[PDB]
Amino acid sequence: AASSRAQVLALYRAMLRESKRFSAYNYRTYAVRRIRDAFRENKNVKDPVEIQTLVNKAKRDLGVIRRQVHIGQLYSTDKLIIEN
Amino acid sequence: ALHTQVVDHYENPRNVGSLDKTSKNVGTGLVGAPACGDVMKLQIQVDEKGKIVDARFKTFGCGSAIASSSLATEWVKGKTVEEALTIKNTDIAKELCLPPVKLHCSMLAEDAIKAALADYKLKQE
Amino acid sequence: SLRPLYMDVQATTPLDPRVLDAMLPYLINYYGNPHSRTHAYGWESEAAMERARQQVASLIGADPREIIFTSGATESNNIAIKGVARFYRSRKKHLITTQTEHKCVLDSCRSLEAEGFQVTYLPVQKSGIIDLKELEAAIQPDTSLVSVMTVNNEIGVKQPIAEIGRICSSRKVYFHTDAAQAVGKIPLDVNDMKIDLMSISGHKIYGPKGVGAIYIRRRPRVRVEALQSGGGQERGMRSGTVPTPLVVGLGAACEVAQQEMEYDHKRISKLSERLIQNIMKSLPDVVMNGDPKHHYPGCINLSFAYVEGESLLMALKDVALSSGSACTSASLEPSYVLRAIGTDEDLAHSSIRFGIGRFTTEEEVDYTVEKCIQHVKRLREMSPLWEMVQDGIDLKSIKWT
Amino acid sequence: TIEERVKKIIGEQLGVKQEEVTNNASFVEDLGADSLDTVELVMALEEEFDTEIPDEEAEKITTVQAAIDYINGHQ
Numbered sequence: 001a002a003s004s005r006a007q008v009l010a011l012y013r014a015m016l017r018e019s020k021r022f023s024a025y026n027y028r029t030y031a032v033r034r035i036r037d038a039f040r041e042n043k044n045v046k047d048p049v050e051i052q053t054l055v056n057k058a059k060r061d062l063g064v065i066r067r068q069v070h071i072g073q074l075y076s077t078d079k080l081i082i083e084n
Numbered sequence: 085a086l087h088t089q090v091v092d093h094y095e096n097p098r099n100v101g102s103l104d105k106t107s108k109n110v111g112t113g114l115v116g117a118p119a120c121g122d123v124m125k126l127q128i129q130v131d132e133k134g135k136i137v138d139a140r141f142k143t144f145g146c147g148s149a150i151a152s153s154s155l156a157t158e159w160v161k162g163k164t165v166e167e168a169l170t171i172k173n174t175d176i177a178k179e180l181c182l183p184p185v186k187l188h189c190s191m192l193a194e195d196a197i198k199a200a201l202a203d204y205k206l207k208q209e
Numbered sequence: 210s211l212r213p214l215y216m217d218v219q220a221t222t223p224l225d226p227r228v229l230d231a232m233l234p235y236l237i238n239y240y241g242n243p244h245s246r247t248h249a250y251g252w253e254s255e256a257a258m259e260r261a262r263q264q265v266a267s268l269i270g271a272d273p274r275e276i277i278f279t280s281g282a283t284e285s286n287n288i289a290i291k292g293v294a295r296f297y298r299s300r301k302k303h304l305i306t307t308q309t310e311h312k313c314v315l316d317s318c319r320s321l322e323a324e325g326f327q328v329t330y331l332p333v334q335k336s337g338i339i340d341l342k343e344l345e346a347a348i349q350p351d352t353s354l355v356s357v358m359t360v361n362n363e364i365g366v367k368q369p370i371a372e373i374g375r376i377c378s379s380r381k382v383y384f385h386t387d388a389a390q391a392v393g394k395i396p397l398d399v400n401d402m403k404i405d406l407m408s409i410s411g412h413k414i415y416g417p418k419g420v421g422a423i424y425i426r427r428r429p430r431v432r433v434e435a436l437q438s439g440g441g442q443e444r445g446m447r448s449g450t451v452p453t454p455l456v457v458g459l460g461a462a463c464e465v466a467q468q469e470m471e472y473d474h475k476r477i478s479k480l481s482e483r484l485i486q487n488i489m490k491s492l493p494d495v496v497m498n499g500d501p502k503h504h505y506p507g508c509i510n511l512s513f514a515y516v517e518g519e520s521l522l523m524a525l526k527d528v529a530l531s532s533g534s535a536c537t538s539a540s541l542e543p544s545y546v547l548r549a550i551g552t553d554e555d556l557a558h559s560s561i562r563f564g565i566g567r568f569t570t571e572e573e574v575d576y577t578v579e580k581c582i583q584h585v586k587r588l589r590e591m592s593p594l595w596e597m598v599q600d601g602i603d604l605k606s607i608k609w610t
Numbered sequence: 611t612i613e614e615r616v617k618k619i620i621g622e623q624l625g626v627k628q629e630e631v632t633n634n635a636s637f638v639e640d641l642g643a644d645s646l647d648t649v650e651l652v653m654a655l656e657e658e659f660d661t662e663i664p665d666e667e668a669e670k671i672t673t674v675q676a677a678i679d680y681i682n683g684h685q
């Protein structure tokens with residue numbers, strides 16, 4: 001209801017870029033995968049009100065990701081054996 | 085926590101294998117039970133002067149069991165049959181820093197040394 | 210040093226970042242006691258507590274008034290078992306449970322036997338599943354409680370909860386299920402399943418440690434004697450200071466699990482099938498403990514014949530796992546669960562539990578499978594039992610010392 | 611390889627044999643991409659080539675050749 005589509009593609013890029021900054025392999029791989037899967041799963045929603053609900057949820061989760069990426073950087077640890 | 089002395093006997097295995105049970109110069113000790121989660125096979129090869137010249141082992145058991153029996157197999161080499169008989173569970177435990185919950189492993193390793201030696205001795209008249 | 214892969218989610222889970230994010234405000238500025246009635250620090254802390262209560266209730270189909278916060282499913286199990294038994298102790302002295310329950314259920318029942326109660330510990334079949342008809346036959350006129358856990362923590366096998374609730378409801382016997390390993394992973398509805406009490410653990414569902422809950426049905430009313438004495442918090446059922454940050458984290462984890470359960474189940478099912486099939490197609494003499502037809506896929510318990518479990522864990526040095534061999538489980542006791550499903554003792558020393566959770570990756574599974582295949586082969590080549598079997602010997606014929 | 615690691619990225623991202631990834635091909639019209647795919651594709655190119663591609667440049671990268679051109683012109 002303010003170009004859902006521009007909000008949506010901008011959010012998609014922002015969420016993927018910020019989730020690649022997770023220091024922890026398990027949060028990072030999960031967030032990137034989950035975001036890809038969720039936007040794809042919801043691609044064919046057509047009700048403008050339902051789209052707006054999903055967009056508002058994505059904005060809330062983008063805030064979660066930004067905060068958690070930054071507090072996983074403050075308290076980071078060694079990489080996992082499979083990151084080598 | 086991690087126990088570097090014990091894990092070494094798995095990551096850097098030595099003397100794992102078998103000797104020829106039919107040899108008059110080979111003693112075989114097989115002790116423990118599958119149902120108790122610890123079975124040690126220890127074999128010694130003795131030369132015609134009574135010096136243990138080689139030894140091999142196979143163990144089903146936790147890491148401390150593998151280390152106890154592996155250490156015992158190293159330690160008998162170069163000892164006379166009479167000298168090997170004096171290796172004690174407590175020497176093995178000390179070398180490996182075994183905690184009290186695992187001292188039963190070093191005792192079964194001692195039992196294995198003595199079973200192998202008794203097998204050898206029975207073969208010499 | 211590089212860190213090992215976490216494949217032990219049945220032991221505990223990492224916190225979902227969405228859960229830590231919800232908790233953090235209560236650890237920084239919203240630090241009020243939720244029992245403080247005269248000020249805004251108390252009001253906002255109370256309001257967060259009550260929001261979390263609704264989140265827990267929504268996941269299981271309950272009314273928030275039926276949710277009591279506790280310090281973990283251990284405490285919830287004690288409250289359900291001891292609370293119900295002690296309340297109806299004038300009229301009822303018998304309770305029924307199973308041989309594969311978690312240790313807090315079994316030891317609560319043992320404590321009650323020392324109190325003069327009679328307990329039937331039902332056997333399970335080799336599948337790990339109770340026999341519903343044996344449960345029916347065991348209910349007595351003075352039976353106050355049946356307790357049967359939803360998902361087993363060791364082998365992952367699902368008990369027929371809805372069918373047990375039908376049996377208990379029809380005989381007016383209270384039905385408790387320890388749902389610690391099932392909450393947020395498989396559908397739970399207290400009314401469709403006819404559940405009277407249920408134990409919930411926050412740290413088994415990406416929530417923080419030190420918190421849990423107990424569902425206590427209010428219609429028809431289920432009565433329980435409180436165990437923790439105090440000022441009457443949590444409707445007189447759990448006195449003490451409700452830990453706002455922790456219960457916020459529990460409600461957030463339940464909310465997230467409600468939204469993510471279907472996605473997780475699909476993804477974990479596929480990873481679980483991959484791990485089981487890839488190991489079994491590459492190694493002989495590998496057996497799954499528990500019936501795969503009634504099984505939560507994220508808990509996989511396999512036995513590797515002729516290799517001792519602790520040694521395999523040691524060998525899998527960069528993977529965090531767990532085992533049923535006695536020297537690894539607090540260093541005391543062998544697996545009573547494997548014994549109850551009729552596993553030969555030696556094979557039960559040979560069992561490993563693999564956990565797959567919300568954050569597990571396909572590469573983490575592939576790495577674990579590859580190392581498992583390599584190390585089982587290596588430990589077999591070290592094993593006198595494998596050597597004897599390869600020379601055609603029947604281990605059942607040997608006379609062990 | 612050469613600057614056509616660009617071609618490898620496009621094919622990996624879009625599930626298209628390297629044979630189909632021709633210089634003239636449009637991601638959407640020719641290779642079946644949707645707009646979620648093309649967000650991911652641009653990020654894949656940013657990753658592979660250690661370069662930042664801002665929105666007004668991303669919106670022009672719609673064909674294989676535009677992607678090659680852009681990467682050649684930014685080290």
Ligand SMILES: *P(=O)(O)OCC(C)(C)[C@@H](O)C(=O)NCCC(=O)NCCSC(=O)CCCCCCCCCCC
Binds near residue numbers: 051054055
């Ligand atoms: P393109 O092919 O031109 O267009 C793509 C879109 C999706 C914009 C197009 O198909 C469209 O407009 N569809 C209309 C419906 C729609 O907009 N669906 C998207 C709604 S937004 C959405 O689904 C967000 C889901 C958020 C998932 C976040 C998971 C976070 C996890 C965090 C963990 C710590």
Ligand SMILES: O=C(O)CN(CCN(CC(=O)O)CC(=O)O)CC(=O)O
Binds near residue numbers: 020021028032083
């Ligand atoms: O996007 C992802 O799924 C995760 N990572 C890659 C995860 N890596 C680990 C690492 O980067 O050290 C995978 C691996 O190395 O196994 C993206 C990124 O690098 O930002």
